[PDB]
Amino acid sequence: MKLFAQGTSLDLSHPHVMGILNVTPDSFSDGGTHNSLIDAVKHANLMINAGATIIDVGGESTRPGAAEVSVEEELQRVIPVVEAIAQRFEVWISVDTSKPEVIRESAKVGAHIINDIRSLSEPGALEAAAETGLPVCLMHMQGNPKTMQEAPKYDDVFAEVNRYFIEQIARCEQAGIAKEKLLLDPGFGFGKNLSHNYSLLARLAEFHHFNLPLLVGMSRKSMIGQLLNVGPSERLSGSLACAVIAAMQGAHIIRVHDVKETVEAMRVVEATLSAKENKRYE
């Protein structure tokens, strides 16, 4: 499969590692945007050099009790980091925003994929994505990510994530975004408990019936932390196991913090799925 954006294509026959670059207020310092601009631009360079093919630049945190960020604060941080990267390097850039203004502006400075974890549900978001014309990632979420609320009860989580995708693709086709430009993502850790997350991981091979690209984000989440009982620094081995499981079943993009070791894992998976008659495990 192939994505086409900004005059270029992305070939999804092999898995891409998407590096994370979060440029929040509490990290892209002091007041209103520092010399943190060189750090951002240096961080991207190491990831690109670790083998990353997409960088996901985002200005909000979505962990529990995370503060709201305003459009000014997003536009000050995200857009100059997006522009600087696209000028300097030939990577693909996803913007992890939910605000319409930030979608319209990232488009103009060179971003390639809109990766809104809220799946364009904010007033005005869907049509900003639509006029942009770029690939959009749709993600399953239940409840609000930034709350301190325990997890939903699902009658069945696979069936519910799957109904959600059916609904969402239609919404998009009606806005005028062709099913050709969507990517789907089960939302690991968003409104799911430990079992719901591993049931969704165990059956990931099966969301391929949509014939859309699969994006997966599992790096250093609680699905590894609680299972192993380690802290956020101590989750690399468990985060690599989630990336290999997921790419063995054909996921197209793996969004990680630890780009060097994930890219290295993806290479062994490549080696393996290439010798494997139907190129996928199920």
Ligand SMILES: Nc1nc2c(c(=O)[nH]1)N=C(COP(=O)(O)OP(=O)(O)O)CN2
């Ligand atoms: N497509 C996609 N985007 C995402 C996903 C994900 O699962 N899929 N997870 C996130 C987790 O956000 P959090 O604020 O917990 O932190 P992180 O940027 O360090 O991963 C944030 N953004």
